[PDB]
Design a protein around this ligand. Sequence first.
Ligand SMILES: [Zn+2]
Ligand SMILES: [Zn+2]
Ligand SMILES: [Zn+2]
Ligand SMILES: [Zn+2]
Ligand SMILES: [Zn+2]
Ligand SMILES: [Zn+2]
Lengths: 336, 336, 337, 334, 336, 329
Amino acid sequence: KVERFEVPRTIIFGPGALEKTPEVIPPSGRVLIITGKSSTRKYAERVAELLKQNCEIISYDQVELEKPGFDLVIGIGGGRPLDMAKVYSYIHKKPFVAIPTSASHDGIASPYVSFSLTQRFSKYGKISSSPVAIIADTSIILSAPSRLLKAGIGDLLGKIIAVRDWQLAHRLKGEEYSEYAAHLSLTSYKIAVGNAQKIKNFIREEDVRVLVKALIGCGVAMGIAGSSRPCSGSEHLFAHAIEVRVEKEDEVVHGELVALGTIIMAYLHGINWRRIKRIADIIGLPTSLRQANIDVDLALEALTTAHTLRPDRYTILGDGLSREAAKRALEDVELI
Amino acid sequence: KVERFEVPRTIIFGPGALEKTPEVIPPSGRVLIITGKSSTRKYAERVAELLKQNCEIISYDQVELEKPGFDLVIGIGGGRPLDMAKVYSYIHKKPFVAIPTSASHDGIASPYVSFSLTQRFSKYGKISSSPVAIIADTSIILSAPSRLLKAGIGDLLGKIIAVRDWQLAHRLKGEEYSEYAAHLSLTSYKIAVGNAQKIKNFIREEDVRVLVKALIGCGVAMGIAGSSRPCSGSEHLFAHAIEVRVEKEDEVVHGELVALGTIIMAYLHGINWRRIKRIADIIGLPTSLRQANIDVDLALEALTTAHTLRPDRYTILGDGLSREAAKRALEDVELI
Amino acid sequence: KKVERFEVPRTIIFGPGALEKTPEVIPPSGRVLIITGKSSTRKYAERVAELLKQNCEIISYDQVELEKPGFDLVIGIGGGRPLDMAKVYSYIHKKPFVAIPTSASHDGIASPYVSFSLTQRFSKYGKISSSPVAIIADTSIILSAPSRLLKAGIGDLLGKIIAVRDWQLAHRLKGEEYSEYAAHLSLTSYKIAVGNAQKIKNFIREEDVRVLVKALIGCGVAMGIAGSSRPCSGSEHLFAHAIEVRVEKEDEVVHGELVALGTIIMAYLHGINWRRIKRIADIIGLPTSLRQANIDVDLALEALTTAHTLRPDRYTILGDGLSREAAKRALEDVELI
Amino acid sequence: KKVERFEVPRTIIFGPGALEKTPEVIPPSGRVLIITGKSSTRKYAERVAELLKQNCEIISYDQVELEKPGFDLVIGIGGGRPLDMAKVYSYIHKKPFVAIPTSASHDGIASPYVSFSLTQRFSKYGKISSSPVAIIADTSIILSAPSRLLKAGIGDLLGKIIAVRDWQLAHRLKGEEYSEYAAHLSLTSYKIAVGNAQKIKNFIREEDVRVLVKALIGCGVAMGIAGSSRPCSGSEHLFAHAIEVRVDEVVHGELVALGTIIMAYLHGINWRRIKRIADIIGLPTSLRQANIDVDLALEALTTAHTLRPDRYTILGDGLSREAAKRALEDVELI
Amino acid sequence: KVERFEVPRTIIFGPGALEKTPEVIPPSGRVLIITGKSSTRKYAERVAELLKQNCEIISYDQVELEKPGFDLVIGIGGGRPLDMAKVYSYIHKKPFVAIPTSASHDGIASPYVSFSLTQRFSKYGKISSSPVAIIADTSIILSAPSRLLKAGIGDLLGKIIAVRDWQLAHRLKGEEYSEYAAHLSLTSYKIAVGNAQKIKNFIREEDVRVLVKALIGCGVAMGIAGSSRPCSGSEHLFAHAIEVRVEKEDEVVHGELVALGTIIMAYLHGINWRRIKRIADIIGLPTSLRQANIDVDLALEALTTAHTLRPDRYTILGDGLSREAAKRALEDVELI
Amino acid sequence: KVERFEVPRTIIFGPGALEKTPEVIPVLIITGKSSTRKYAERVAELLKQNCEIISYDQVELEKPGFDLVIGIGGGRPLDMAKVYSYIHKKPFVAIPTSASHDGIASPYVSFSLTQRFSKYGKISSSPVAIIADTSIILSAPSRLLKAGIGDLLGKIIAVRDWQLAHRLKGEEYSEYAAHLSLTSYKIAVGNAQKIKNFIREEDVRVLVKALIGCGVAMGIAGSSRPCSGSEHLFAHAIEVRVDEVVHGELVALGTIIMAYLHGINWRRIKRIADIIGLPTSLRQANIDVDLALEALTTAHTLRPDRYTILGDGLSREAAKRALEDVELI
Ligand SMILES: [Zn+2]
Ligand SMILES: [Zn+2]
Ligand SMILES: [Zn+2]
Ligand SMILES: [Zn+2]
Ligand SMILES: [Zn+2]
Ligand SMILES: [Zn+2]
């Protein structure tokens, strides 16, 4: 039967593209500008001058999601404000404009909210908010720690696993599948390996224009697929199961964990994992648990429980990676 | 240097998609519906009924592209009414909704019109009109003529030359190149070569799905590239060189010419042209000039001048194919 | 850390006339029981009795008294049925078993294990497992078995690609013991089966039968090295077993045909080349549709959705269960319905 | 068209403290001859006397009267030398043989064959061949073995790639009987020997010894299925045997490893990959390191094809002196 | 060990290159023109017309080799007259000029006479006459039966085995070896496969140009090796052993036998015989003994005895192919 | 139509091959003004006929009156002899005392020197014999030999540029010459590690036989085309802007760049170029970046009748990116 999806209609790319955001706002109604914490306020303020629209700027933690009376919602910052804007957008049925400030994740253009253990927004229904436009100011994005930008490559790497898991789940459990969305996800995976050596450093914006487009493409894949399955499988379960067991997320980064998870899940899938390490090193991502200061026993506890995080999502983890099996995996792949 | 690009906002795709047309049409506006002159007339009438708005049906060959008066332009039919709708949309700066009832080439989702029309109406400027929406009803597309459906796969075969030529122009001339766009174009090519055997008869809706998917993918690639580069190279130059030299563009089938050009330019590029020809025969596409009823002296004129249709764009053709080299190429690839 | 014991068949004798050398593996003293079949296989048991100066009991498998003690040696002679029953009796009393296959239906001719149904039926005795100390495969006799059941020997071999792939997965996921030795042996039988299927499939010459028999014995040695049926049985055998316990009588289906069908299906689920395995099965004349095999769609779905529950300790591609919807899609895509 | 018979070891008891299960593979009655070494291996023999309800007769290979009758079962307990003696005795008197390797120096711990040299001395009797009815490899014990000899185990395994290549050649050229089952089993032992060499070379932990012993047993199983030593012995072993009849100064596995390197060169394959692996283990990779006189190695290589004329290898008619001289140069063995 | 060898000094290629032969024959001195039979005279007679020098024409079977008084000798025709001219050249230390009318053999530029069971020419010593120049008129050569030009390619297919046989002989027997000679030989093998598909029809005078230059380079290769080892091994032994046992050479042709030999010898070497059989079919060469009209007992006899034809040359046949093994090879490679 | 080519009649090759020189000749002997004069003398002893030894500087070429031209020394005495050999109908023997250049065995003179005596036309003088003493070619400056492998590496480009020129512009092409040229290329790469050292004897033989192959290929082909394409247009472009660079090191640099332009595996060529100890950067090669950019943007104009992947020219902006993306900068 009939599939339908949305794509960001307008995408502005380049240095000081933040200046151009008025081009993509209709000259109509009031504008909620959701922002991050804490250094994203310059930009969110920066924006508000350029618009003849009256626009209130609430930080994501202070947003009254049910409060109507806004005709458009911008979101600016990282994952948190962007999700929050998506939720606002969905509840009120209003256009959403994404203005990412960092590229470490693939939600940038996904209509879906990030995975949440407590299910922060389950109350609001099946949220689907494909941004009507994306302002990708490469200068803002660029001048960010090289850690968090090289990690965004790491996130791309996991798409080889996520597609496999999703295919498996389709064949074993009948989960809805889209051949195209999977190809689209791998298009973005194939970009990350083909331009691996090329952009590892990030001296120029030309390097992150490739990154961010590739992440944006993953977002649209999820949109076609109907969920994050094309871009997030066992390798992200690994990440999610770690970052739930750290005190502060501050002491660990998603895209590294994803990249580490990818090495592990490649081994479990019985595909070439040696190579994915070879790319990970070349990018400068940690290819060892110790290198990421991840405790051996923390990994084993995550690995052996990750199949329970998302019970309606089947991966190569199947029923449970056993402890003894996870120990050995870490060894053969050399994380430990 | 800051670049901005557009792609379709909404894509509704599958058996019966025409019935969901109003979902993408603003509640206010008077609508111009451009269609063809026979089989396509009923589909336009069907859409006129669905809309709750002021609208007007008119054959592509009765439109006065100068007269003003419509807020929204729909193109419904084969490549020709969609093309004319795009010109109208460009001229009067109005939104465009593409409703392909066939799948002849990559025109169904792109912002560009044929080469002939780009020339004919170049008084108005460089025609370009990204559709806000694409309604791709695969049940309606199934009933389209099978020669044209096959020709659509032909259009897709060219993308391997288009990308190589583009990469060549990037490395040798500094032409702007988009990694993402190119990969996305190559994905559509791999889909085409991968499913050609299976889909070529177009007896099932599932055959159409695969073709239309890949074609839309190419339209979008052109959107992201900001040019036809990812989907048009030296193989298209050949096809255009033939298209301008006929009295009417309907003496010729675009995809068929592109398929012939692709065999030729693969040879010039030094890759495996025999593979391409083999796929082209499997599909039922003409693989000699005689099979396509194209005259050899005309083919030679086209080939020797093809580099002058777009002399700002470098391709393997460089500053031109010599006539004996042209002749020899047609001979080696067994086109004559 | 743990001490491991493995049993492998000691003496393997095969070729034309091999029945005549049976006495070379029968100890001088002792009381011998000979379990054989109901009709045709009896003459071959009689023959074996003459070579031992008739000092043994002969019985057909359906008339064995499993609690009867005092025998020193049990010999199975016939098709899979009496070899199964010989293994059961052999296990109950902890006596040496000698396999004298008269047919080459499946790898049972050389493994320690018996049919899934029989293993359940007599579970009160333990996990039935009798590794034959000796195998005597007369290829001229085996040449005379039914063509359908000989082709089914090949079908049983086709499943080894799936079983090894399921075993590897189980190793990586559950840390279950794995032996490259067992696996490479079992995959060699697989290799030889597909490689020679076109040539041997009619089994009109002793050489054709020789190929099949050696591949089945190789599997038997593989299971011995492994300490389990893992190298020769996986998710494809689960499908077979799930059909086998649900049928009114054994002979309504043939094990090796079911293995072949399940091999196509599980190959689809593993995402490997099922098209290639299906072609090989059509070359042999093995059923490649539920219709041909005389299996009701509903029985096959119930079987596909529950097969993972038959041996829960045994991880396969089936995970924690193939859904009905997914089972139906696969049947469709592999053209078994 | 002939009937064929194959013997494979029936029971394989493998692991730490496996020696204690010995009574499980020994029959209820019958005289038991235990043959063992003369230094360290006696205590291991001694325990078997205990564990075995029955009186048995512990005796060194040094002192075995071969023609002396009197036993229903022969155990060989120790390294290669008592196990060979046990198989000869067993072959002579037609009695079941149990292999209880205390070391793992070569694939003789699970094969039915004895050293080439020994096969000659007792050729009077026929081809000495005793397939062990059972194998009891206690990896705790085996770990106490000379590292040098354990390392030589991996040496003996390095030859299998050649033995199988010679076997495949003989099959295609001479029509000699071939078993893919035996071939792939022997190559698995090889694939594993190389894959784990660096990891297991030191033999400090049971893990190490277990992978070596498994790979040797596999080889034994391969020889049983094939009904010959073809899976585990080709031109590399021919080279080794030719040295072994001209000198216990040298070690079997070391010789096989050197031969392997040379026969890899002759076969046109990757001798460097093999030599790399041999040095990684710490096996002699030169005539100098090995203490083999060049003229003796040359005599060996030029005559090696005459030891078993019935079995074709890459040596064919005979390697010429110049070629053998060249060979040793190219592989930097001299 | 200082090495020396000769290479044809002057080579002349094209349509009517026979008209240019007086170009490569010094002005003074008497010229022997050794011709084949029977219709070969027309070419020798024409060369005599163009020659200012006094010159006798003699059928190769009427040549008195020991008769001096000729300053230069021309071989014109097949392998026999050319070999006869090589012997003359060597006996008298006189210039040899080669004029091949066929391209069915690698003798054209070879210093050495072909294999002979009877040892026709052994009395004259180690014959080595690299022609000083070659006159390769592609018109006359293209004028050969289509069947026999195809065989010429077959001859080139054997070189992959000859080199392996040679390497094996160098390694096991210390036979003299030349890496460069082996490579030049393979150069011509790769050209055979590289251009197999296209040139195999021989419509074009340019198809034959490629063939003959391949055959010539094999010639030179033998010169560098100091013998024919690098262009003849076990595959040629099969051919020769068949040629020795047939009643009439016409009954079978040489190149087809080499190609068949090559398939068998590849199997024995344990390399990809399928690849070679595929290329042989594409060329149009026989790939079964039935297709070549060859008794199976004949082929078995040839195979089992071929190791004794040239006992100073070692090959994969080594000590001898057993009858059972030779039957199996024939089955396993589907020649029977 | 019909064409004829020449290749060397006799080739003497190995340790002490220089003593067999009387074998090949039935005299002018052009040498240098360097350590090469040593061997120019070591020969005239063993020749019955009179020999005027006279180095390329003092060589006068209008003047006839010699029966045979012998080139002994580097690439330049060899090329002068070819020149001198072309003007008069006199045979050329080539006695290379070094292995830096493609044309030790080639009938064509360097591009630089072809443009000097263009009064007589394209010079083509295939040496009737080649004496290649491997023992002396060791004592030749060591890096100059190292380069030779480098000069070899450019053939993969030269062959592809040539095919392109054939298929696009209709230039004459020889399958055989191309495959022969390519075999030389595979010899260079295939042994670069095992011969990297230049310690063993064969380490000179492998290079020299590969180079000779090319000369022969050029002869067969009737042009430098199988051995000189766009990678060489780079080298020739650098060479006319100076004498502080080795020809073959440039060719190797050009090969990396042109491999990148062509879309093939320039990294693989980069790996191999390192092993030999060739410059894999303009810095490493002591090359002013401005120079290299002008070389790269101008090189298509050197031989306008010779099409390559350069087409009608590399843009200044693309040249810099190219340099940067292949890490030459
Ligand atoms: Zn992520
Ligand atoms: Zn098009
Ligand atoms: Zn079974
Ligand atoms: Zn050994
Ligand atoms: Zn020939
Ligand atoms: Zn050069």
